[PDB]
Amino acid sequence: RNKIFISHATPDDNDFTRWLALKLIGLGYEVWCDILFLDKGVDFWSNIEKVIREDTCKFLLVSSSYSNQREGVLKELAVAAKVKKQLKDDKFIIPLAIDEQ
Amino acid sequence: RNKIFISHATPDDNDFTRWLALKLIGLGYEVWCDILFLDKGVDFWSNIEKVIREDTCKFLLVSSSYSNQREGVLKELAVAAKVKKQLKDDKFIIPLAIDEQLSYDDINIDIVRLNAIDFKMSWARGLKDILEAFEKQKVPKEVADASKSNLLYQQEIYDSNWLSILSFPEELRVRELTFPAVRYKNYLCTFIPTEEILSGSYDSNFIRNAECKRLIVQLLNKAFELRMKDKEVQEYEMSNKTAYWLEKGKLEKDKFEKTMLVGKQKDKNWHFAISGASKLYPFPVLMISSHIFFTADGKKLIDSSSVQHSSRRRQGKNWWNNTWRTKLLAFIKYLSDDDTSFYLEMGSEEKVFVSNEPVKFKGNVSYNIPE
Amino acid sequence: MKELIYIEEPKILFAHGQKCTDARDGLALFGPLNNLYGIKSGVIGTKQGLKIFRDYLDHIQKPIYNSNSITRPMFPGFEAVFDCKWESTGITFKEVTNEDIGKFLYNSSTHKRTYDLVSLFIDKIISANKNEDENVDVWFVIVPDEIYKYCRPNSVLPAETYNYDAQFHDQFKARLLKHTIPTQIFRESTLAWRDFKNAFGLPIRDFSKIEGHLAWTISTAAFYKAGGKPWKLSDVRNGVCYLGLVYKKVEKSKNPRNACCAAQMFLDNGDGTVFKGEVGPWYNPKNGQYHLEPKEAKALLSQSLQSYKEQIGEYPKEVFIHAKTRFNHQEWDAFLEVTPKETNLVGVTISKTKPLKLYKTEGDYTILRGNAYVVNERSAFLWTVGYVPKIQTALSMEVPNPLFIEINKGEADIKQVLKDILSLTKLNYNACIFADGEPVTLRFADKIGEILTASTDIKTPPLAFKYYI
Amino acid sequence: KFLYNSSTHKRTYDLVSLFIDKIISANKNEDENVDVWFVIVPDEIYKYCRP
DNA sequence: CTAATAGATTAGAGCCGTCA
Ligand SMILES: NC(=O)c1ccc[n+]([C@H]2O[C@H](COP(=O)([O-])OP(=O)(O)OC[C@@H]3O[C@H](n4cnc5c(N)ncnc54)[C@@H](O)[C@H]3O)[C@H](O)[C@H]2O)c1
Ligand SMILES: NC(=O)c1ccc[n+]([C@H]2O[C@H](COP(=O)([O-])OP(=O)(O)OC[C@@H]3O[C@H](n4cnc5c(N)ncnc54)[C@@H](O)[C@H]3O)[C@H](O)[C@H]2O)c1
Ligand SMILES: [Mg+2]
């Protein structure tokens, strides 16, 4: 349970998300996101859940106009909220803000 | 798209699944189940996918410790999620919780954001949960049955007859003499303070407290007998007790305060009668019992208990709570003396006063009276 | 102004572990507890009775409907409810010619004719049980209406035969006790209720709108007498044994004397309910004395305690002795010296004599069924008959009478006493009703005593109710 | 406690009673409808109960 | 022991209603 999970909209936030993920990896933090991580030929919806439930210490969320309405990010946020309630951790979710409109 | 798909783990959850499928079929819906409609010798994954994709309106999932993390269930869930996305119905998937051993923090990642239904407490409760949801979401109900499926869908202050005794004569201190008198030893008992007799206090080798209470009760009963003799009310001798009733024409049109105490039944009249017994437990009261007696021409009774019993059975068949209550209260108010009481002559001056309204009880629970 | 408390409904348990307050709804929706495979029926009677019984068996295979469904639920057919088979193909018939019934019913003496008729009917059953290979679960007796009206205590027609009561039913049930054969007596007019009429072209008994009720009752009785379990009590406190005492006068035995018969109920290991009789009458020569001598009471308590200990292994923590009379010191002191020290004896008197009636102000229906007026810490009134909201009607006509409960010996909480009495009214297997008026510990202990006093002494009679009701 | 008397007659009587009393009790005072009764006799009971 | 006056208890029998 020592992996940073990055949720975001796709393919609209891949540039910023890739920048952030590469920077975090370079600084030494284990991160996760579809690009560079999801395996081809796997049950994804059911691997979006295992990693969130068993291999996550923090839950970053890239917020923008694209996010906060996408179904996938909302599902991931709901599972993250449930995991936070279970863990009794106050700062499980970190809502990054990158937009202004 | 009018088939309710049911996803479960086979054969661990077969009992509940079969029960639910049979219930939903009985109510009128169309159900597809892995154990009741799959064919023998058919390509089953392809048929299941076709059923999920082409004809399916609801996807009821049986959620338990077995159905969680099962390959078939998960593949069906994935295809159903695709169909939900394509169909723009946010309530296409509905988990059903039936296992008490499955914690809400361990459910699939595909159903975390979904409102499950609880069958853990009772299966009928969950059944009506799902029926309410179906009514709201307007799932097509193929109602091909009448008077059977709808029947499967369908499947305070009180009065009393106690008259409290308001007062007693102060001191206690042959049945054919004017006042109530009782023989006892060489003495005579008739109206020791009575406040202490009715407290379990007085005791002596002359008389015991229980015997004294019995004698007081006997005096009260004799006084009531004489008092009703002095009211000019006709009497009927029952098997052990006596009853009193009013002659036809005695009341103004056989009515006292918008209540009728004498009426008609075929070739007979019917008369409302009462009898009284005085008791000291649990508190001094005068218990009243209701009876109906039938007279041939309205004045003379019938010297036959068989016909009396049959007619009494016929008359009470239509009476109900309000009829009995009002008739009893009206008779008591008729016997009332001045405003709220009614005395029994216990001697030259002494009197026993009886209330003319019954004891009132109160509760906290009733019924809505659904007509 | 006085105060009334209300007592919640007990609930009973059915298949799948489901609960409900109405027996009919539970049997319809979930079904019985245990699983029989089928009922094989033995019929004894004439050919008319055989035809009538076959027709009725065929009648109740399909769903039957009542006029008012809310008051009385529908009957969905025998097998839909009970998950077993009871058809007119498992019938084994033993004919009884009409000449015999005519010729024996001619002595003008009630005792001789009753004895002869009972012997005629029971000898065939005894032979069919001894000398034959076929298997019979419940024997069904179909008596013509003409013999029923003449075999009654006071009956007039318009040799160890004087030692029995002159009632067909009691003597018939008693004389089969030593062979342990279940039986169900019917009347020809009970099954063929249409064919028996009066001066007008109507049946004497009209079952047109209550036919599903009759189907429910007959089916439940037949399913219980075949060794079935249609429901049970959901909540019964552990370590509590309930008894019941009733006195039946043993008429015309060398003097006026009277006996005593009992019943018992408790929860055993495995969440089972052991509702069974307590047999062996205990007498006293005195006339009109409804009590026990110390010697005859020590035996009864020892028997009951030994039975409970044998089935459970430890003595009851609580024993409640319900009765319709009042105990005295001489016999209650016989108690408490056979009882252990780790057990509580409580004697409850239940009577329906005190005339209290409660009426609603500005209404038309009666009082609820849970209401109780607590007079004291040793006395209270309980309404076991009244308006039930579920069936939208009351269980009686006119205004019901309350049931007067009085703690007589020992100390107990009256609210708990009422709670335990109210749940004892849901176990009437002779009936298919919402609930009874009095506890069945006092009603089933009465049938056994009524059947045991209509015959000569019989050693070690059966305890199971299926041989009595 | 029964198949030890060393007298064939008495132990045969006792064992027959032990089985038949239960069978008859079940027959007379229970609510089932049993078509046949199947008696599973351990080998020792049958072995020595011969004449 | 016998025969009456009552209050407070008990157990038996027999008849009627169940809907609209
Ligand atoms: N953890 C992350 O970094 C992250 C970010 C966004 C979404 N997600 C997840 O959410 C997604 C679903 O939400 P959405 O509809 O907004 O996503 P989406 O926009 O990626 O899905 C819509 C389309 O489906 C395509 N698609 C479908 N199945 C695919 C597969 N197996 N591999 C690659 N592309 C596939 C996507 O490429 C896209 O074109 C996917 O399940 C998964 O990628 C994860
Ligand atoms: N309730 C469920 O678990 C469920 C529901 C729908 C589909 N499925 C699918 O998943 C199942 C997995 O079964 P399992 O391997 O765990 O156990 P299994 O095959 O021993 O038992 C499962 C049952 O076997 C039967 N079955 C399987 N293959 C069959 C075939 N080729 N021909 C005929 N009958 C066949 C089906 O009735 C299936 O439900 C079956 O492959 C298929 O029905 C399961
Ligand atoms: Mg019966």
Side-chain angles (χ1 to χ4, degrees):
Chain A
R1 194 173 279 280
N2 64 7
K3 272 152 63 139
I4 311 298
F5 191 97
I6 307 189
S7 161
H8 60 95
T10 308
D12 308 333
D13 305 354
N14 307 144
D15 206 68
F16 169 86
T17 304
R18 193 184 301 264
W19 183 87
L20 164 68
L22 287 186
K23 292 265 167 259
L24 276 173
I25 288 160
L27 300 161
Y29 287 90
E30 204 168 357
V31 175
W32 195 101
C33 174
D34 56 299
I35 320 163
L36 305 186
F37 295 114
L38 172 71
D39 276 298
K40 294 290 154 59
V42 72
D43 187 0
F44 49 113
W45 267 130
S46 304
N47 219 49
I48 294 169
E49 180 202 30
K50 172 57 73 211
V51 172
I52 292 173
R53 279 207 189 259
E54 302 189 0
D55 297 331
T56 307
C57 56
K58 297 282 147 160
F59 188 93
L60 300 199
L61 177 71
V62 174
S63 73
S64 72
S65 175
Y66 305 111
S67 293
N68 82 14
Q69 294 301 329
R70 208 65 56 90
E71 293 179 353
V73 308
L74 289 202
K75 292 177 176 41
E76 295 158 283
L77 185 83
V79 177
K82 295 188 180 319
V83 177
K84 179 176 102 170
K85 187 181 288 294
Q86 196 178 7
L87 283 168
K88 325 289 206 275
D89 181 8
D90 196 16
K91 308 297 184 36
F92 193 64
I93 307 179
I94 304 295
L96 304 176
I98 71 158
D99 202 341
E100 295 203 297
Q101 214 195 8
Chain B
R1 293 183 177 276
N2 55 326
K3 295 182 94 60
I4 297 89
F5 188 97
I6 307 179
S7 193
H8 65 263
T10 288
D12 314 285
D13 301 337
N14 265 328
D15 284 329
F16 173 83
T17 287
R18 201 193 321 269
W19 184 82
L20 180 76
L22 293 176
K23 291 285 176 218
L24 284 175
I25 289 159
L27 292 157
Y29 304 159
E30 291 176 354
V31 173
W32 198 98
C33 198
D34 175 27
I35 54 170
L36 294 172
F37 305 87
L38 190 53
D39 272 294
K40 305 283 166 152
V42 72
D43 190 354
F44 51 96
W45 291 109
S46 308
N47 188 19
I48 281 159
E49 189 199 355
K50 187 261 285 189
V51 167
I52 297 175
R53 281 198 192 262
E54 265 181 343
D55 50 356
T56 290
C57 49
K58 285 288 181 292
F59 185 98
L60 292 186
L61 172 74
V62 173
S63 187
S64 55
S65 179
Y66 299 114
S67 304
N68 198 331
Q69 301 320 128
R70 291 287 287 261
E71 293 302 329
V73 171
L74 288 180
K75 297 211 270 169
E76 293 167 353
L77 271 155
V79 169
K82 304 300 190 187
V83 175
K84 164 165 85 174
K85 187 265 186 182
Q86 207 163 23
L87 187 62
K88 297 195 284 283
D89 179 16
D90 285 325
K91 298 271 180 179
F92 182 74
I93 299 176
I94 299 183
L96 298 176
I98 66 160
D99 187 8
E100 190 160 352
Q101 277 147 37
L102 183 71
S103 178
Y104 281 157
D105 49 44
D106 292 304
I107 50 175
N108 269 328
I109 189 163
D110 288 328
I111 61 178
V112 289
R113 275 170 58 78
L114 275 80
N115 300 318
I117 290 161
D118 192 72
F119 274 78
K120 306 180 187 182
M121 52 185 288
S122 59
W123 288 6
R125 178 67 274 166
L127 194 85
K128 296 294 98 175
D129 280 355
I130 57 172
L131 270 298
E132 296 294 328
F134 288 1
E135 296 295 337
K136 189 267 183 179
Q137 284 146 2
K138 190 62 64 66
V139 175
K141 173 159 68 212
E142 178 57 28
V143 61
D145 198 0
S147 280
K148 341 286 185 185
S149 47
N150 300 98
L151 270 63
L152 191 65
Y153 205 65
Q154 194 190 58
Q155 175 165 26
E156 275 274 319
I157 310 172
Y158 309 91
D159 288 339
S160 63
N161 56 330
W162 288 3
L163 302 165
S164 83
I165 289 179
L166 304 165
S167 62
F168 270 94
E170 203 174 341
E171 276 173 1
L172 179 44
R173 91 183 61 178
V174 306
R175 62 184 177 177
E176 285 286 328
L177 64 90
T178 177
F179 297 121
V182 184
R183 275 182 76 94
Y184 186 66
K185 308 218 186 146
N186 80 95
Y187 290 91
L188 202 78
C189 190
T190 184
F191 281 122
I192 311 96
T194 66
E195 176 60 27
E196 70 204 25
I197 290 304
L198 297 172
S199 62
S201 283
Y202 181 91
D203 284 319
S204 72
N205 54 57
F206 178 67
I207 187 160
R208 280 168 40 154
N209 216 344
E211 182 58 32
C212 196
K213 295 186 165 53
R214 203 182 61 87
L215 291 174
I216 286 171
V217 165
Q218 167 166 351
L219 279 170
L220 275 162
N221 283 357
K222 193 73 212 309
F224 174 71
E225 185 152 10
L226 273 169
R227 184 63 173 142
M228 301 273 270
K229 285 177 185 174
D230 196 274
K231 285 285 182 192
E232 187 59 22
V233 178
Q234 297 294 113
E235 64 186 1
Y236 180 92
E237 266 299 327
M238 297 195 48
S239 180
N240 46 31
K241 64 193 151 193
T242 318
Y244 312 91
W245 45 281
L246 302 151
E247 176 63 25
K248 188 196 187 159
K250 186 162 181 287
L251 267 289
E252 194 258 327
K253 213 172 267 195
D254 301 304
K255 181 184 281 285
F256 177 91
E257 280 166 354
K258 69 178 286 181
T259 309
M260 183 171 70
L261 300 184
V262 184
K264 178 82 165 148
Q265 178 182 359
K266 294 177 72 69
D267 301 330
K268 282 164 268 297
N269 274 108
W270 69 257
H271 303 258
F272 189 91
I274 67 156
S275 70
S278 303
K279 303 298 217 290
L280 285 168
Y281 175 91
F283 47 95
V285 291
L286 183 38
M287 286 156 173
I288 312 299
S289 278
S290 305
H291 319 271
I292 321 173
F293 300 120
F294 295 77
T295 56
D297 75 336
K299 192 208 300 174
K300 182 172 74 68
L301 298 150
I302 303 164
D303 287 330
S304 178
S305 293
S306 301
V307 298
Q308 300 266 19
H309 190 253
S310 307
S311 306
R312 186 263 182 272
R313 288 288 99 198
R314 283 193 294 270
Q315 187 77 61
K317 161 169 68 215
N318 297 113
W319 294 8
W320 288 121
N321 165 64
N322 202 2
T323 314
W324 290 103
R325 167 196 163 272
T326 59
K327 290 200 189 318
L328 192 72
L329 301 205
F331 199 98
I332 299 304
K333 288 292 289 186
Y334 166 72
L335 292 186
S336 189
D337 210 24
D338 64 346
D339 184 30
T340 55
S341 66
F342 164 64
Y343 66 71
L344 306 171
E345 291 180 353
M346 293 298 221
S348 162
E349 176 158 28
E350 284 87 28
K351 269 166 203 188
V352 162
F353 279 79
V354 188
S355 180
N356 67 328
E357 287 157 23
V359 180
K360 295 262 198 72
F361 291 78
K362 186 203 166 79
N364 274 316
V365 193
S366 70
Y367 38 94
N368 204 2
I369 302 170
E371 66 199 2
Chain C
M1 190 68 78
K2 312 291 171 38
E3 300 295 321
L4 307 191
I5 59 172
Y6 167 81
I7 300 196
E8 280 313 323
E9 204 58 47
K11 280 191 179 303
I12 44 176
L13 198 71
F14 310 93
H16 298 126
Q18 304 300 302
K19 280 193 280 311
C20 197
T21 55
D22 197 332
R24 282 83 63 93
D25 293 337
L27 282 170
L29 295 165
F30 318 110
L33 281 166
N34 83 331
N35 165 47
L36 308 183
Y37 301 99
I39 304 161
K40 268 161 280 183
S41 74
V43 187
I44 181 166
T46 43
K47 295 294 289 184
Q48 185 69 255
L50 175 58
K51 183 181 163 70
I52 281 156
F53 186 78
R54 282 205 300 254
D55 291 347
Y56 189 83
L57 272 179
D58 292 356
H59 165 67
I60 63 152
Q61 307 290 309
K62 311 183 248 197
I64 319 183
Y65 275 106
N66 283 286
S67 197
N68 196 357
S69 80
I70 298 168
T71 299
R72 313 169 144 81
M74 66 179 181
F75 191 60
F78 180 86
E79 184 182 16
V81 182
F82 296 98
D83 216 352
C84 85
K85 193 66 63 62
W86 180 35
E87 44 187 346
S88 74
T89 291
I91 293 167
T92 302
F93 177 62
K94 306 290 286 194
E95 185 171 357
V96 159
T97 46
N98 221 338
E99 284 94 10
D100 308 332
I101 288 169
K103 96 200 300 176
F104 278 132
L105 186 68
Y106 281 161
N107 309 146
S108 294
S109 185
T110 183
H111 293 290
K112 182 159 163 56
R113 91 191 161 207
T114 291
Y115 189 80
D116 282 351
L117 270 165
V118 173
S119 285
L120 162 65
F121 267 90
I122 65 148
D123 281 352
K124 308 187 164 299
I125 286 177
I126 287 168
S127 287
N129 191 247
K130 281 170 75 163
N131 316 329
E132 276 191 3
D133 283 320
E134 299 90 30
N135 289 337
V136 164
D137 281 29
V138 190
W139 271 97
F140 297 89
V141 194
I142 321 296
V143 311
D145 290 329
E146 59 87 5
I147 77 180
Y148 166 84
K149 298 289 178 182
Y150 298 165
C151 307
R152 297 178 80 189
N154 303 342
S155 43
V156 64
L157 183 136
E160 282 156 349
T161 187
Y162 271 67
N163 258 330
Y164 297 73
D165 278 17
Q167 178 64 66
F168 185 95
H169 168 269
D170 273 349
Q171 200 169 342
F172 176 90
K173 301 298 290 292
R175 279 169 74 185
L176 296 162
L177 279 183
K178 77 192 307 310
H179 307 292
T180 53
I181 295 141
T183 303
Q184 165 73 41
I185 279 168
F186 287 114
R187 288 205 292 147
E188 273 189 29
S189 45
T190 286
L191 313 164
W193 60 271
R194 296 176 170 88
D195 300 333
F196 285 71
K197 300 171 168 64
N198 74 79
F200 300 153
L202 279 77
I204 286 175
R205 289 199 299 283
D206 199 348
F207 292 111
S208 297
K209 294 154 184 197
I210 54 171
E211 198 179 3
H213 203 260
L214 180 61
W216 268 110
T217 313
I218 287 168
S219 302
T220 310
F223 179 87
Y224 180 71
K225 266 154 193 178
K229 288 153 194 316
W231 66 82
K232 66 188 289 182
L233 265 173
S234 76
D235 60 356
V236 179
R237 189 174 67 245
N238 200 315
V240 185
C241 180
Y242 304 85
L243 272 162
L245 279 71
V246 173
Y247 286 89
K248 305 291 279 177
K249 273 153 72 151
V250 172
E251 291 96 29
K252 270 69 79 186
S253 279
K254 299 204 65 150
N255 81 317
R257 68 182 181 179
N258 56 9
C260 180
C261 315
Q264 62 186 358
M265 200 281 283
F266 51 79
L267 181 81
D268 71 344
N269 314 326
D271 298 294
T273 295
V274 187
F275 189 25
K276 161 177 70 177
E278 190 72 24
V279 69
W282 304 266
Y283 311 82
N284 63 324
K286 199 69 157 41
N287 178 32
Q289 187 70 33
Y290 303 121
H291 277 142
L292 285 169
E293 299 288 331
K295 189 192 170 294
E296 276 63 7
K298 292 181 181 179
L300 187 146
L301 269 193
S302 302
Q303 197 169 299
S304 170
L305 292 164
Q306 184 67 251
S307 279
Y308 183 99
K309 179 177 177 66
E310 163 181 337
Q311 298 196 7
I312 305 300
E314 304 148 355
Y315 282 119
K317 295 193 185 78
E318 304 281 329
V319 185
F320 294 78
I321 303 192
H322 305 344
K324 55 175 74 174
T325 56
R326 280 168 174 78
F327 310 101
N328 76 344
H329 277 332
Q330 182 172 38
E331 78 187 3
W332 187 265
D333 264 4
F335 302 173
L336 295 167
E337 70 179 358
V338 301
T339 318
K341 302 297 175 295
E342 48 194 359
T343 291
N344 199 42
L345 282 190
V346 189
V348 185
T349 304
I350 301 150
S351 59
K352 52 194 87 168
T353 293
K354 291 197 184 268
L356 170 62
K357 277 190 188 305
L358 288 200
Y359 309 90
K360 298 231 292 185
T361 56
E362 300 214 2
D364 177 88
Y365 288 73
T366 191
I367 186 170
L368 262 191
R369 171 170 190 264
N371 285 127
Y373 165 48
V374 171
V375 175
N376 213 358
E377 192 40 58
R378 294 175 78 81
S379 184
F381 289 93
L382 183 70
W383 274 264
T384 52
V385 190
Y387 178 96
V388 165
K390 167 177 186 152
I391 63 185
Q392 275 182 8
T393 186
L395 276 292
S396 59
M397 294 184 187
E398 315 191 0
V399 176
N401 305 288
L403 193 67
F404 181 67
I405 294 90
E406 173 209 359
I407 283 167
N408 208 6
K409 306 279 189 271
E411 62 267 13
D413 194 357
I414 194 78
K415 289 184 178 64
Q416 192 94 71
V417 161
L418 308 153
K419 187 142 186 140
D420 303 323
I421 285 171
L422 199 73
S423 73
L424 279 173
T425 64
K426 308 300 279 279
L427 289 179
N428 201 20
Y429 298 120
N430 215 42
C432 204
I433 48 178
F434 176 74
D436 199 72
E438 75 197 17
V440 302
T441 46
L442 284 172
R443 188 189 267 285
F444 274 31
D446 185 57
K447 304 177 182 286
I448 296 169
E450 184 146 16
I451 278 162
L452 283 170
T453 56
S455 85
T456 199
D457 61 324
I458 51 175
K459 274 166 57 179
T460 57
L463 291 188
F465 289 133
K466 73 188 179 191
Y467 307 129
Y468 290 108
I469 50 153
Chain D
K1 70 196 295 184
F2 284 146
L3 196 61
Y4 284 161
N5 182 268
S6 290
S7 194
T8 181
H9 277 306
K10 191 150 165 299
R11 61 184 170 84
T12 301
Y13 195 88
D14 295 334
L15 292 173
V16 174
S17 285
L18 165 58
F19 278 89
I20 69 162
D21 66 356
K22 298 186 164 291
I23 292 173
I24 303 157
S25 283
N27 179 75
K28 284 175 75 173
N29 304 327
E30 294 201 27
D31 295 305
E32 279 96 356
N33 201 258
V34 180
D35 298 321
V36 190
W37 273 102
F38 297 87
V39 180
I40 323 304
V41 167
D43 273 312
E44 52 267 359
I45 288 172
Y46 160 73
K47 202 181 290 290
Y48 317 109
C49 283
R50 291 198 225 161

